Every structure is written in C-alpha cells, then in structure tokens.
Amino acid sequence: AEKRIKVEKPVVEMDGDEMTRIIWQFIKEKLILPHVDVQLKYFDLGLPNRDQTNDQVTIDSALATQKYSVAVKCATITPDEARVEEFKLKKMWKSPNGTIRNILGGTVFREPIICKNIPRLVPGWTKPITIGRHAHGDQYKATDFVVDRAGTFKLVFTPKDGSSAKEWEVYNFPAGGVGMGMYNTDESISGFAHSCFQYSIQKKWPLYLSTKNTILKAYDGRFKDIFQEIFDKHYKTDFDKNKIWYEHRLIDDMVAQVLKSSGGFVWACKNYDGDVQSDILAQGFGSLGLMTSVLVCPDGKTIEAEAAHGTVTRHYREHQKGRPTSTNPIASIFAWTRGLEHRGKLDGNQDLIRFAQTLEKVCVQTVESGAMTKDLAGCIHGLSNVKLNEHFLNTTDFLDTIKSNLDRALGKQLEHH
Amino acid sequence: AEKRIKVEKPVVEMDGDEMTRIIWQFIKEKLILPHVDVQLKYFDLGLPNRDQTNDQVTIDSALATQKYSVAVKCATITPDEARVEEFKLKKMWKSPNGTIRNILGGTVFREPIICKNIPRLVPGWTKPITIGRHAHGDQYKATDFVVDRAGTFKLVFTPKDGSSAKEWEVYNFPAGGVGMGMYNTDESISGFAHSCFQYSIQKKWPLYLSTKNTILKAYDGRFKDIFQEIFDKHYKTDFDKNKIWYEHRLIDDMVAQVLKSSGGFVWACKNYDGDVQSDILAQGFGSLGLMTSVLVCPDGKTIEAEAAHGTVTRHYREHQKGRPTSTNPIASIFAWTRGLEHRGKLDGNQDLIRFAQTLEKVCVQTVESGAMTKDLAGCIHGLSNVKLNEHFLNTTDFLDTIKSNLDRALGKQLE
Ligand SMILES: [Mg+2]
Ligand SMILES: [Mg+2]
C-alpha cells in the first residue's frame, strides 16, 4: 500500500490470553500496523500479569480508556478452580470485563456479522437483530454468600442525611442455604436508556425493553418507568417521525416473539439477559465467532470494542508444540476495526474510517468466497466432512488471504479518484 | 364406556380466569366426568374470588394438594396496574403460581407436545427436550425496593445459635436507585437435584445443569456442588449402567449449545432461567400452546399439573361480545390428563392411566389429521393466509371434534 494513515490521538490496547493472544499479534502485524500509524497505550490483561499486579492493571486500563476515549480488548480468562491450580494464582480473580464495565459504565451493543453463505439455525431471521446489554450492576456487581446454620438474613438501608434506617427481613433460614444482594443506580439506567433510543433512531428500527416487572415490582419497574419517562419526554416525536415505535415487554413473552419474528429491531436487555440472549442470537445467526461487542459509555465519546467469544483453550495446546490450528480470528479483527472507526469519528479522520469499513467488507467477502477456518466450514459442510486446504485453511493462511484481499481492495481505492 | 372409570382417591381442582376458565369447564363437563368418577376438591383461584378471600383460597388449594397429592390448575391472572383498575382490587395480589410453588416446592418439568404436521422454528431439534425448572426461591421470593435519597445499603446475617453476626456493605448510594436481596435453601436444591436425576434415569437421557457460577461464586456454586455431590453418592452408577452422563455447564455456553444440538436430553435450569428458556423451547418446537408443565414435589408423591400458556385476553373480549374465537385448548386438556395419569399411577388404576393416554393421543391425532385452531394453522400457512372453516375451526368446534374423536377411540377400545 501507500504511506500509512496518520492517527492523531492514541488507542488503548488490552492484551488477552492463550490462543486469542497469538492471533491478536498476527492481526497487528499483517493487517493494522502496515496501513495505520497509531500510538498504542499497552496494558497486559493476560492472567499472569493480572496475578502479578493483583488485578490492578485491569483498573488502570479502564482509567486509561476514560482518558483517551478508545480501547480495543482481546479475549481474557475469567479463572475457575482448575485455573488457580494451573497458573499457581494467589487469588481467584474476578472477571476483568466486570471490573472494566463497572468502572466505565454504559451499554454493550451486540450484533451478528452477516456472511451470506453461512446457514442460520433460525431460518426465520432474515434481517439482523441488535441487543443493547446494560453494562453495569445487577448480578455482575452482586454480593453473594453461603449460609451454614440457622439465622436471619436481612437488608438494611441507612440514609446519609440521618433519618431513621429502613429494614427488610429477607428470610429466616431454618438450616443451610445461600443468599445474595444486588443493586443499580438511577443514573446508569438513564444512560442505558439514552444509548438505546439514540441507537434505535440512527438505525431506523424499533426498540423493545424486556424485563420481569410482574415479579420484581420495585426493581424491574424502575427500568420500565425510566425508559417510558425518557421516551415520552425526549424521543417521542423522533420515533413517530421515522415510522418506528418503542414498547416494553415481558422477558418470557419477548424471547418467543424474537424467535418467531423476521428480526430487524433493537432489543434492550438487563445485564444478565444480555449475556444469555446475545449468545442465542449469535449461534442462531450462524456462529458465536461472528458477533461484535462495543461498550458505548454514557458520556458519548468513550468506547471499548472487544472480542465477543471466549479464549480457545484446546487450540492453544497445539500452538505451544508448533502445530497448525484453525481458529476464527474475525471477532478479534472487528474489535480492531470498530475501535479505529470510532477513533476516526472523534477526530474527523476520513481515511481511517474508510479503512476500517473496507477491512470489515473484506472479512465478509473472504468468507463468502469459500475461504475460511474450520469452525465456519463446519457450519456449512458438517464438522467431520472437511479436509485441510480444500474446505477450510489454517489460521495464518486465512489471515494471509485477508491481507492479500485487503491490498487488492485498497488497490481499487484511490486509483479511480 | 357405558360404566365410568372409578377413582378411589380425590383430585384437587384449581379454577382459572377469563377464556381458559370457559374451556376448563368445557373439558370438565364433556371430556372428563362422563368417563371418570372422580371426587374433585374445588378451589376457585379466579381473580374475583382471590380478592374476596385476600389470596387465602390460593394457600388453601396448596394445602389441599399436599393432603391428596394431585392437583390440576387452570391458567390465572397475575395482576398488574391495569387489573387493579379493572377488577377494583384492594391490593395487587402476587402470582398464585408463585404462592403455590413456594409452599409445595420441587421441580417444574416442561416438555413439548409433538404434532408431526406442525413445523419447528428450529429445524435442528429432531428429538424433544425436557426442561427441569427449579420451583422455589431466587427472584420469585425476593425482597426488592426503590431508593429515593443517598445512603448505605448493606446485608446482615444474624446466626440463631448466638455466634458472630456478619455484615456485607453492598453499595454506597450517591443518588437514588434500586436494591434487592434473594435466597435459596440447601434442601430445596437437593430435592431439585434428586428429581432431575430420577427423571433423567427414567427417560434414559443425559442431564445438564446450567449456572453462571463464574460470577456468582457462592450462590450458583452451591447448585453446581450439591448436584455433583448427590450425583457421585447416589446416581453415578445407574447413569453409567444406562449409557448416560451428568455435566455442569455455563448458562451462556448451554443456550448456544442447545440451539446448535438436535435435542434428546434433560436440562436442569434455575428458577429464573427455566421460566425464560422454556418459552424458547416451546416456541421453537412449534407453538406456546403445545407445552406441558408438571410441578413434581421433593417427596415424589405430590404433583400439580398446570396450564402452560397464559389466559390470553384478546380472545375473551370477543367472547364477551358474542363473537366466536380460536384459542388453543390442548394445554388445558393435558393438565387434566397428566393429573389423572399420575392419580392412576399412585392408586394402581390401569384404566385411568389408559384413558389419560388415549385423550392425549387423540389431541395429537386430531391436529395431525387436519382439524386445528387459528394459531396452529398460522404455523403451517402463515397468520394471514387462513380461512375460517377451511384451514382452521373455532374453539367450540375444535373441542367438539376432540370430544367426537375421543368417543370413537374409546368406543373402538372395547373389543
Ligand atoms: Mg457471553
Ligand atoms: Mg413463562
């Protein structure tokens, strides 16, 4: 290609774990840095460094993302019991996404990456669906415990001004059990709502906020109340103007509608439902690998693009020994592209935005032309009916095909001006 | 059946609301009692009577279910803001299904009804899938509240044996917000697990418990642990004998893995997940109306077979104005059959069991042959390519067709 595109402001990079960390490197080397001059603020969120720093690098990386307004994040391991044994960890550390999302706040938007030849497990979904997952609070900022004896679990609220304290007896445990408490601010639900309406306007689509307000009257009612209050006060005229609507729905009614519908709408979820229902969407549209994830913070400027799927552990065992693999890198690629795309919007850099979009176009077209990794070929032909270099190809070979197609596609650009 | 089938012990009947209430008494009058002599213990759980009794009749029906060990429940209204204006209720009463499940406890087993002519929205699922929803606790017995000003929200556990009281600060509120707290006992999780393992063995299918124990390490971890403890102590040897397995899984891995698979397993969900994921299975397998729902208590004897779908109001307004409707009653019929089928198995009554099966086989065959309601027609032809008395029948007509086919099927049996 020509001279590299000069990016004025920096971009935070959060490095990942095991096999997603290796393809992360090959993406920077072959696709990003050859075409883009960018100042990269590095943070290693790999599990070894998190252990060494005591999960402090996770906090510092989030604070850096607040400062420079853009981050890109590779996939990381949230450690279980076996991982503490393997990595010799001093503590079973909490989810780094949880720590970051709590600090930044806002709304995780998730939508599928549409490859026209990839078959859908849900034939009904002709148009694409976007989830707006609430990034803060609920189960991901909870306080849970085990009860080993008889006792009285209660909630207590002590006002700051000094008026008398309120109390609620949750349960008198007769013997052993478990208990937990969670929360959410009005502020975070407001910023969550603003994000979902504004995205619903920009997309020219309707919005649906699912809750379970019939059971949790005070808690889930506050979601429905704040959404309806903001809709009718700010975006009522704009939805009517654009031939679209906002509605609430019951969560168990909603998941039936979605599976039955043709699609083509925004779907606002609470924190927990966003996690569960977005992995249904992804898999229904074709594959877990084909999905984006962009945490849009309430301030309007800040984002954290990231790899949707988890780390590929079994494929990492092969790369240690020096053997080939076939791991789909497209999620990691799109995390980079959406990071640069938003970097460009913030600075008015038109070349950077068009580069990002061109790379997204290429990744799709490459798969559409029958060049793909094993997991995507398994969607088409069946998982045990595919040969090496015939139906699918290796991970670095697939990246080399994208590298090649990117240069070709960038060749058709500028030459016609 | 010139003489009816006698039933030694009683059955509890919980009457419902609006349109299902109408088709409930249709089923009682012309489908059940003509062929079965069964002493029913009537409890009206309609919303007007629940207001009359301060939701006490709801409790009374549960205590009756404990005594006689079988219940059948029509669909009821969980009232919202709009219902308190309409019915002029004194208080916005809580869910009667919530109140009953809390008192009885156990595992709500939900599985689809397979009609071969109905298409599935998930082509992958060749074989059927049974969810085992946990009946008790979690969000359904939660204390939740709104926060109007700044303050410190904390939890407190005060041991009864006089040991040290523990406290956890949850959050220090700057502005307003919301907070809640919930619980679950170890005994509830045991009976839940046992019920799931016994059903998984009797089906000869593998079991999968799903949790989010990476995040809620203590709470969801307790489920993972108790299931695994009970498996290895009691059931591992019988699972191995029938070529089946138990496995834990992460919830967001499970929902992907289920949709990808071709079914044929038992899926043990927690209380909240079972509510949501059962509607995905139902809708995906064909339609919300083609779903059974049987609460199976920890003791093994007691059950409560309920109507899965809600009491759809759209159609009830047409009925009140004289016009015909097209609601699917098959759910409500299966509530009866599964009640009677269990009533028969408890008492050793082979005739009652055969009858219950015959009616289920009739409901399926009736749809498979061609006769069906509007919503089941819409699954095949689409919702706006359907003709009244061509592609579908009325609610009244459909029930008379089932009554006819039941009588002819029963009339063929005696030979
Ligand atoms: Mg996930
Ligand atoms: Mg439900």
Residue numbers in the entry:
A (entry chain B): 40 to 456
B (entry chain A): 40 to 454
The authors write:
In this CR-mediated pathway, we have shown that mIDH2 activity was regulated by its acetylation/deacetylation state.
In the crystal structure of wild-type mIDH2, two molecules were found to form a dimer in the asymmetric unit, which was also found to occur in previously reported structures of human IDH2 and porcine IDH2. The two subunits share highly similar structures (root-mean-square deviation (RMSD) of 0.3 Å for the superposition of 826 Cα atoms). A hydrophilic cleft is formed between the large domain and the small domain and serves as the active site where the isocitrate molecule and Mg2+ are bound. Amino acid residues, including Thr117, Ser134, Arg140, Arg149, Lys251, Asp291, Asp314 and Asp318, was involved in isocitrate and Mg2+ binding by hydrogen bonding. In the structure of wild-type mIDH2, Lys256 did not bind isocitrate and Mg2+ directly but was adjacent to the isocitrate-binding pocket, which might importantly stabilize the pocket conformation by regulating the arrangement of the large domain.
